[PDB]
A paper describes a structure:
We studied the structure-reactivity-activity relationships of a series of analogues of the [name] inhibitor poziotinib with point changes in two substructural regions as well as variations in warhead reactivity and geometry. Surprisingly, the work identified a pair of enantiomers 16 and 17, with significantly different activities. Crystal soaking was used to obtain X-ray crystal structures of 16 and 17 bound to WT [name]. The crystal structures clearly showed the formation of a covalent bond in the potent S-enantiomer 17, which was not observed for the R-enantiomer 16.
Variations in the cyclic amide spacer group bearing the acrylamide showed intriguing variations, changing the piperidine to R-pyrrolidine 16 showed a drop in potency for both WT and DM [name] but potency was regained in the S-enantiomer 17. Intact protein mass spectrometry analysis was carried out on all acrylamide analogues (see SI) and pleasingly, all demonstrated formation of a covalent adduct with WT [name] with a single binding event. Around a two-fold increase in the level of protein modification by S-pyrrolidine 17 compared to the less potent R-enantiomer 16 was observed, which is consistent with the measured [name] potencies in the TR FRET assay. In cellular [name] phosphorylation, the more potent S-enantiomer 17 showed increased inhibition by more than an order of magnitude (pIC50 > 8.0 compared to 7.1) in WT [name] overexpressing A431 cell lines. The difference in potency was also apparent in DM expressing H1975 cells. This difference further translated into growth effects in A431 cells, with 17 demonstrating a pGI50 of 8.1 compared to 6.5 for less potent R-enantiomer 16. The carbon-sulphur bond between 17 and Cys797 in WT [name] demonstrates a bond length of 1.79 Å and bond angle 113˚. These measurements align with standard sulphur-carbon bonds and, therefore suggest the formation of an unstrained covalent bond. To further assess the impact of the chiral centre on covalency, kinetic characterisation for binding of 16 and 17 against WT [name] was carried out. This showed the same difference in binding affinity with more potent 17 showing a 6-fold lower KI and 3-fold faster kinact relative to 16. Molecular dynamics simulations of [name]-bound and unbound ligands in explicit water were carried out. These indicated that the [name]-bound conformation of 17 was also the lowest energy unbound conformation, whilst for 16, the non-covalent bound conformation seen in the crystal structure was significantly more favourable than the covalently bound conformation generated in the docking studies.
Residue numbers in the entry: 696 to 1019
Write the structure that this text describes.
Protein backbone atom coordinates (compact mmCIF):
# COMPACT_ATOMS: atom_id res chain seq x y z
CA UNK A 1 0.00 0.00 0.00
CA UNK A 2 2.88 2.30 0.95
CA UNK A 3 6.56 1.34 1.24
CA UNK A 4 7.63 -0.17 4.61
CA UNK A 5 9.69 2.08 6.81
CA UNK A 6 12.66 -0.09 7.65
CA UNK A 7 14.59 2.56 9.57
CA UNK A 8 16.43 1.18 12.60
CA UNK A 9 15.72 2.71 16.00
CA UNK A 10 18.84 2.34 18.17
CA UNK A 11 18.28 2.20 21.93
CA UNK A 12 21.44 3.55 23.55
CA UNK A 13 22.54 2.82 27.12
CA UNK A 14 23.01 5.86 29.35
CA UNK A 15 26.42 4.53 30.45
CA UNK A 16 27.80 5.22 26.97
CA UNK A 17 27.36 9.03 27.23
CA UNK A 18 29.96 11.27 28.93
CA UNK A 19 31.02 14.94 29.31
CA UNK A 20 27.40 16.11 29.29
CA UNK A 21 26.99 19.95 29.40
CA UNK A 22 24.09 22.32 28.76
CA UNK A 23 23.63 24.01 25.39
CA UNK A 24 20.25 25.57 25.97
CA UNK A 25 16.88 25.30 27.64
CA UNK A 26 13.23 26.13 26.95
CA UNK A 27 9.83 25.35 28.44
CA UNK A 28 10.05 22.09 26.49
CA UNK A 29 13.31 21.03 28.09
CA UNK A 30 17.04 20.95 27.49
CA UNK A 31 19.65 20.25 24.85
CA UNK A 32 23.09 19.09 26.01
CA UNK A 33 26.31 18.23 24.23
CA UNK A 34 28.29 15.14 25.10
CA UNK A 35 30.36 12.28 23.78
CA UNK A 36 28.84 8.97 22.86
CA UNK A 37 31.27 6.10 23.27
CA UNK A 38 29.73 2.86 22.00
CA UNK A 39 31.10 0.09 24.14
CA UNK A 40 34.40 -1.34 22.94
CA UNK A 41 34.60 0.66 19.71
CA UNK A 42 37.52 3.03 20.42
CA UNK A 43 35.38 5.86 19.00
CA UNK A 44 34.06 8.98 20.69
CA UNK A 45 31.21 10.60 18.77
CA UNK A 46 30.31 14.24 19.61
CA UNK A 47 26.56 14.38 20.21
CA UNK A 48 23.68 16.60 21.17
CA UNK A 49 21.03 15.20 23.53
CA UNK A 50 17.48 16.52 23.67
CA UNK A 51 15.11 15.78 26.59
CA UNK A 52 12.03 17.32 28.22
CA UNK A 53 11.61 18.60 31.77
CA UNK A 54 9.96 15.36 32.98
CA UNK A 55 8.56 12.04 31.72
CA UNK A 56 5.11 12.61 33.21
CA UNK A 57 3.32 14.57 30.52
CA UNK A 58 1.98 11.78 28.26
CA UNK A 59 1.91 14.17 25.31
CA UNK A 60 5.58 14.95 26.08
CA UNK A 61 6.97 11.43 25.55
CA UNK A 62 4.54 11.01 22.63
CA UNK A 63 5.62 14.22 20.95
CA UNK A 64 9.31 13.48 21.34
CA UNK A 65 8.89 9.93 20.03
CA UNK A 66 7.03 11.34 17.02
CA UNK A 67 10.10 13.48 16.41
CA UNK A 68 12.37 10.46 16.94
CA UNK A 69 10.37 8.49 14.37
CA UNK A 70 10.85 11.20 11.70
CA UNK A 71 14.50 11.78 12.54
CA UNK A 72 15.37 8.07 12.38
CA UNK A 73 13.74 7.81 9.02
CA UNK A 74 15.95 10.39 7.24
CA UNK A 75 19.43 10.04 5.75
CA UNK A 76 20.86 12.88 3.63
CA UNK A 77 23.93 15.18 3.86
CA UNK A 78 21.66 18.18 4.45
CA UNK A 79 19.30 16.75 7.11
CA UNK A 80 20.08 15.82 10.73
CA UNK A 81 19.48 12.08 11.52
CA UNK A 82 18.78 10.41 14.89
CA UNK A 83 21.69 8.36 16.26
CA UNK A 84 19.33 6.78 18.80
CA UNK A 85 17.25 7.25 21.93
CA UNK A 86 18.05 6.83 25.63
CA UNK A 87 15.18 5.71 27.85
CA UNK A 88 15.78 7.14 31.31
CA UNK A 89 13.55 8.91 33.73
CA UNK A 90 13.07 10.85 30.46
CA UNK A 91 13.13 10.07 26.76
CA UNK A 92 16.33 11.60 25.32
CA UNK A 93 17.03 12.04 21.57
CA UNK A 94 20.67 11.58 20.51
CA UNK A 95 22.10 13.20 17.37
CA UNK A 96 25.30 14.42 15.78
CA UNK A 97 26.56 17.54 17.51
CA UNK A 98 26.39 20.57 15.19
CA UNK A 99 29.01 22.58 16.98
CA UNK A 100 28.41 26.02 15.43
CA UNK A 101 24.75 25.95 16.50
CA UNK A 102 21.71 27.28 14.67
CA UNK A 103 22.10 29.32 11.51
CA UNK A 104 19.93 32.22 12.73
CA UNK A 105 22.29 32.98 15.62
CA UNK A 106 25.28 32.16 13.42
CA UNK A 107 24.40 34.79 10.79
CA UNK A 108 23.67 37.36 13.50
CA UNK A 109 26.96 36.83 15.28
CA UNK A 110 29.27 36.52 12.27
CA UNK A 111 27.70 38.96 9.81
CA UNK A 112 30.97 40.85 9.30
CA UNK A 113 32.64 37.69 8.01
CA UNK A 114 29.75 36.27 5.95
CA UNK A 115 30.21 36.73 2.21
CA UNK A 116 28.09 36.02 -0.81
CA UNK A 117 29.59 32.57 -1.46
CA UNK A 118 28.47 31.18 1.92
CA UNK A 119 24.99 32.70 1.70
CA UNK A 120 24.32 31.19 -1.72
CA UNK A 121 25.87 27.82 -0.80
CA UNK A 122 23.63 27.67 2.28
CA UNK A 123 20.60 28.37 0.06
CA UNK A 124 21.67 25.49 -2.16
CA UNK A 125 22.19 23.08 0.76
CA UNK A 126 18.88 23.94 2.46
CA UNK A 127 17.17 23.41 -0.89
CA UNK A 128 18.89 20.02 -1.28
CA UNK A 129 17.78 19.00 2.21
CA UNK A 130 14.22 20.15 1.49
CA UNK A 131 14.16 18.37 -1.87
CA UNK A 132 15.32 15.15 -0.13
CA UNK A 133 12.52 15.55 2.42
CA UNK A 134 10.05 15.93 -0.46
CA UNK A 135 11.35 12.78 -2.14
CA UNK A 136 10.55 11.04 1.19
CA UNK A 137 7.05 12.54 1.14
CA UNK A 138 7.75 14.56 4.26
CA UNK A 139 6.44 18.08 4.84
CA UNK A 140 8.55 19.84 7.48
CA UNK A 141 6.14 22.63 8.44
CA UNK A 142 8.73 24.43 10.50
CA UNK A 143 11.54 25.47 8.14
CA UNK A 144 13.15 28.62 9.56
CA UNK A 145 16.80 29.65 10.04
CA UNK A 146 16.50 28.70 13.74
CA UNK A 147 15.81 25.11 12.46
CA UNK A 148 18.97 24.79 10.36
CA UNK A 149 22.15 23.74 12.14
CA UNK A 150 25.78 24.44 11.29
CA UNK A 151 28.14 21.45 11.28
CA UNK A 152 30.89 23.69 9.82
CA UNK A 153 30.50 27.14 8.18
CA UNK A 154 30.66 25.24 4.88
CA UNK A 155 27.99 22.63 5.83
CA UNK A 156 24.46 23.11 7.16
CA UNK A 157 21.62 20.65 7.85
CA UNK A 158 17.92 20.96 8.52
CA UNK A 159 16.58 19.71 11.88
CA UNK A 160 13.65 20.06 14.27
CA UNK A 161 11.20 17.53 12.85
CA UNK A 162 8.65 17.89 15.64
CA UNK A 163 5.98 19.22 13.24
CA UNK A 164 6.89 17.11 10.22
CA UNK A 165 4.16 14.95 8.69
CA UNK A 166 4.44 12.29 6.02
CA UNK A 167 1.97 12.02 3.14
CA UNK A 168 0.03 8.93 2.05
CA UNK A 169 0.72 6.96 -1.13
CA UNK A 170 -1.89 9.16 -2.90
CA UNK A 171 -2.39 12.16 -0.54
CA UNK A 172 -1.41 15.84 -1.12
CA UNK A 173 -2.37 18.25 1.70
CA UNK A 174 -1.76 17.71 5.39
CA UNK A 175 -4.76 19.31 7.18
CA UNK A 176 -3.66 20.03 10.80
CA UNK A 177 -5.67 21.07 13.91
CA UNK A 178 -4.50 23.50 16.63
CA UNK A 179 -1.22 24.10 18.51
CA UNK A 180 1.25 27.03 18.49
CA UNK A 181 2.32 27.79 14.93
CA UNK A 182 5.18 29.69 13.25
CA UNK A 183 2.79 32.14 11.60
CA UNK A 184 5.44 34.40 10.06
CA UNK A 185 6.93 31.44 8.14
CA UNK A 186 3.66 29.99 6.92
CA UNK A 187 2.05 30.10 3.52
CA UNK A 188 -1.27 31.95 3.45
CA UNK A 189 -3.19 28.73 2.69
CA UNK A 190 -1.63 27.21 5.83
CA UNK A 191 -2.68 30.14 7.99
CA UNK A 192 -6.20 30.18 6.53
CA UNK A 193 -7.12 26.49 6.06
CA UNK A 194 -4.32 24.55 7.84
CA UNK A 195 -3.35 23.19 4.43
CA UNK A 196 0.32 22.04 4.27
CA UNK A 197 2.19 20.78 1.21
CA UNK A 198 5.66 20.63 -0.21
CA UNK A 199 4.63 23.98 -1.76
CA UNK A 200 3.82 25.48 1.62
CA UNK A 201 7.34 24.47 2.73
CA UNK A 202 8.64 26.44 -0.29
CA UNK A 203 7.01 29.54 1.23
CA UNK A 204 8.92 28.99 4.46
CA UNK A 205 12.14 28.45 2.50
CA UNK A 206 11.53 31.92 1.01
CA UNK A 207 11.25 33.39 4.47
CA UNK A 208 14.29 31.49 5.67
CA UNK A 209 16.33 32.95 2.73
CA UNK A 210 15.17 36.43 3.75
CA UNK A 211 16.43 35.78 7.25
CA UNK A 212 19.85 34.77 5.90
CA UNK A 213 20.13 37.70 3.44
CA UNK A 214 19.26 40.18 6.20
CA UNK A 215 21.84 38.61 8.57
CA UNK A 216 19.07 37.39 10.84
CA UNK A 217 16.42 40.08 10.78
CA UNK A 218 13.06 39.26 12.30
CA UNK A 219 10.31 39.05 9.68
CA UNK A 220 7.41 41.48 9.96
CA UNK A 221 9.04 42.82 13.14
CA UNK A 222 6.47 44.50 15.42
CA UNK A 223 3.55 43.17 13.36
CA UNK A 224 1.27 41.08 15.64
CA UNK A 225 0.84 37.51 14.45
CA UNK A 226 -2.92 38.03 14.36
CA UNK A 227 -2.48 40.59 11.58
CA UNK A 228 -0.23 38.54 9.26
CA UNK A 229 -3.01 36.90 7.22
CA UNK A 230 -4.48 40.35 6.45
CA UNK A 231 -1.18 41.91 5.43
CA UNK A 232 -0.54 38.92 3.17
CA UNK A 233 -4.03 39.04 1.66
CA UNK A 234 -3.49 42.75 0.83
CA UNK A 235 -0.43 41.52 -1.18
CA UNK A 236 2.30 42.77 1.17
CA UNK A 237 5.50 40.70 1.37
CA UNK A 238 8.87 40.95 3.08
CA UNK A 239 11.08 43.73 1.59
CA UNK A 240 14.12 43.39 -0.70
CA UNK A 241 17.17 42.94 1.54
CA UNK A 242 19.94 45.52 0.82
CA UNK A 243 22.48 42.93 -0.32
CA UNK A 244 20.09 41.23 -2.73
CA UNK A 245 20.05 41.76 -6.47
CA UNK A 246 16.68 41.59 -8.13
CA UNK A 247 17.66 38.07 -9.31
CA UNK A 248 17.79 36.82 -5.72
CA UNK A 249 14.80 38.75 -4.44
CA UNK A 250 12.65 37.62 -7.34
CA UNK A 251 13.28 33.99 -6.30
CA UNK A 252 12.14 34.86 -2.80
CA UNK A 253 9.01 36.53 -4.17
CA UNK A 254 8.14 33.55 -6.35
CA UNK A 255 8.12 31.43 -3.15
CA UNK A 256 5.39 33.75 -1.83
CA UNK A 257 2.91 33.51 -4.74
CA UNK A 258 -0.72 32.75 -3.71
CA UNK A 259 -1.00 29.96 -6.23
CA UNK A 260 0.92 27.22 -4.45
CA UNK A 261 1.75 25.46 -7.75
CA UNK A 262 3.17 28.68 -9.20
CA UNK A 263 5.87 28.57 -6.53
CA UNK A 264 9.30 27.11 -7.41
CA UNK A 265 10.07 23.45 -6.70
CA UNK A 266 12.97 22.64 -4.37
CA UNK A 267 14.70 21.00 -7.37
CA UNK A 268 14.48 24.34 -9.25
CA UNK A 269 15.77 26.31 -6.24
CA UNK A 270 18.82 24.04 -6.16
CA UNK A 271 19.51 24.79 -9.83
CA UNK A 272 19.04 28.54 -9.55
CA UNK A 273 21.07 29.06 -6.35
CA UNK A 274 23.75 26.76 -7.78
CA UNK A 275 24.10 28.85 -10.94
CA UNK A 276 24.38 31.93 -8.74
CA UNK A 277 26.97 30.34 -6.45
CA UNK A 278 29.36 30.16 -9.41
CA UNK A 279 29.50 33.98 -9.55
CA UNK A 280 28.32 35.04 -6.14
CA UNK A 281 29.22 38.74 -6.26
CA UNK A 282 27.05 39.05 -9.33
CA UNK A 283 24.00 38.11 -7.21
CA UNK A 284 24.72 39.46 -3.71
CA UNK A 285 26.40 42.82 -3.02
CA UNK A 286 28.27 42.88 0.29
CA UNK A 287 30.74 45.66 1.16
CA UNK A 288 34.19 44.12 1.56
CA UNK A 289 32.91 40.69 0.60
CA UNK A 290 36.00 39.49 -1.19
CA UNK A 291 38.05 39.80 2.04
CA UNK A 292 36.17 37.47 4.44
CA UNK A 293 36.90 34.01 5.90
CA UNK A 294 35.25 31.63 8.36
CA UNK A 295 36.71 28.53 10.16
CA UNK A 296 37.33 25.46 7.97
CA UNK A 297 38.05 21.78 9.01
CA UNK A 298 41.67 22.25 7.92
CA UNK A 299 42.60 24.79 10.70
CA UNK A 300 44.67 24.25 13.86
CA UNK A 301 42.25 25.04 16.70
CA UNK A 302 39.30 23.75 14.70
CA UNK A 303 39.38 20.38 16.51
CA UNK A 304 40.97 21.78 19.69
CA UNK A 305 38.39 24.62 19.86
CA UNK A 306 35.74 21.92 20.39
CA UNK A 307 37.58 19.01 21.94
CA UNK A 308 39.48 18.24 25.09
CA UNK A 309 42.88 16.93 24.01
CA UNK A 310 42.24 13.88 26.24
CA UNK A 311 39.56 12.76 23.78
CA UNK A 312 41.02 13.93 20.49
CA UNK A 313 42.78 10.63 19.71
CA UNK A 314 39.61 8.69 18.98
CA UNK A 315 36.98 11.34 18.13
CA UNK A 316 34.93 10.49 15.03
CA UNK A 317 32.24 12.70 13.54
CA UNK A 318 28.85 10.97 13.30
CA UNK A 319 29.02 11.45 9.50
CA UNK A 320 31.95 9.04 9.48
CA UNK A 321 30.41 6.56 11.97
CA UNK A 322 28.31 4.07 9.99
CA UNK A 323 26.69 0.77 11.00
CA UNK A 324 25.04 -1.73 8.57
C1 LIG B 1 18.63 29.18 16.96
C2 LIG B 1 18.66 28.71 18.41
C3 LIG B 1 18.86 27.21 18.52
O1 LIG B 1 18.44 26.49 17.60
N1 LIG B 1 19.47 26.62 19.57
C4 LIG B 1 19.74 27.16 20.91
C5 LIG B 1 20.81 26.28 21.47
C6 LIG B 1 20.68 24.94 20.74
O2 LIG B 1 22.02 24.54 20.37
C7 LIG B 1 22.34 23.39 19.69
C8 LIG B 1 21.44 22.41 19.38
C9 LIG B 1 21.86 21.27 18.64
C10 LIG B 1 21.01 20.18 18.26
N2 LIG B 1 19.66 20.23 18.51
C11 LIG B 1 18.76 19.15 18.43
C12 LIG B 1 17.52 19.27 17.79
C13 LIG B 1 16.69 18.17 17.66
C14 LIG B 1 17.06 16.99 18.23
F1 LIG B 1 16.25 15.91 18.14
C15 LIG B 1 18.25 16.85 18.89
CL1 LIG B 1 18.68 15.33 19.60
C16 LIG B 1 19.13 17.92 18.96
N3 LIG B 1 21.48 19.17 17.55
C17 LIG B 1 22.80 19.18 17.26
N4 LIG B 1 23.72 20.05 17.59
C18 LIG B 1 23.23 21.13 18.30
C19 LIG B 1 24.14 22.15 18.66
C20 LIG B 1 23.69 23.27 19.30
O3 LIG B 1 24.48 24.30 19.69
C21 LIG B 1 25.91 24.13 19.66
C22 LIG B 1 19.95 25.24 19.45
Amino acid sequence: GEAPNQALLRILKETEFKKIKVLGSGAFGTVYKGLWIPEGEKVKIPVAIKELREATSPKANKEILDEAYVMASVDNPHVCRLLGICLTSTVQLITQLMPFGCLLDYVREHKDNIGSQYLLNWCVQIAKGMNYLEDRRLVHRDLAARNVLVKTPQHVKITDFGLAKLLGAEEKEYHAEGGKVPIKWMALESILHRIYTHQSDVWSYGVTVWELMTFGSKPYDGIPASEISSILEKGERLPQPPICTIDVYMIMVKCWMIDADSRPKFRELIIEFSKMARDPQRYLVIQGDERMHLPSPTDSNFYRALMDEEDMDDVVDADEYLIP
